[PDB]
Amino acid sequence: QIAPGQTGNIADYNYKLPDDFTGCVIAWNSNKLDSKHSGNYDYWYRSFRK
Amino acid sequence: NTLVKQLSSKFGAISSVLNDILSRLDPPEAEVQIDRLITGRLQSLQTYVT
Amino acid sequence: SNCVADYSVLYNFAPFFAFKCYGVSPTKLNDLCFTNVYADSFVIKGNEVS
Numbered sequence: 177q178i179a180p181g182q183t184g185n186i187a188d189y190n191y192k193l194p195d196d197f198t199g200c201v202i203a204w205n206s207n208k209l210d211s212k213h214s215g216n217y218d219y220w221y222r223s224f225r226k
Numbered sequence: 227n228t229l230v231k232q233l234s235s236k237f238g239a240i241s242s243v244l245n246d247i248l249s250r251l252d253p254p255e256a257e258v259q260i261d262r263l264i265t266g267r268l269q270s271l272q273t274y275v276t
Numbered sequence: 277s278n279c280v281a282d283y284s285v286l287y288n289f290a291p292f293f294a295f296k297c298y299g300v301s302p303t304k305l306n307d308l309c310f311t312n313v314y315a316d317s318f319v320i321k322g323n324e325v326s
Contacts, residue, residue: 181252181255181301183302185287195252195253195254249304250299250300250301250304251300251301251304252303252304
């Protein structure tokens with residue numbers, strides 16, 4: 177979802193790139209560092225906005 | 227009459243009406259459809275002036 | 277027909293594998309977007325989604 181021209185809860189209310197954006201989007205799996213069996217309150221999305 | 231009538235042509239675009247392109251598509255695709263219309267109009271104006 | 281369609285509900289119904297539009301882009305669907313609406317529903321294999 178993190179790309180120019182995309183839509184969704186993140187592209188719409190959390191992180192938006194300009195449509196003439198240049199640069200690189202690097203992604204990797206972090207399951208062994210961020211995951212907690214009880215969850216992690218610190219991570220959320222805005223999920224609503226004007 | 228020919229120069230005006232050329233405005234109704236699509237020149238490969240979805241629609242000959244510029245406002246329809248802007249209404250229907252987001253900037254990064256609309257720019258391509260507009261560039262196609264611009265190319266067609268540029269050809270028509272150069273032919274007329276020549 | 278005879279419906280004031282609101283397309284944010286699609287994002288509320290499910291996350292999607294694909295949402296490819298031709299002739300129109302997402303977020304532009306809240307202006308006039310349809311004339312004769314037909315919804316074709318079917319089940320295919322993931323490898324056949326393309």
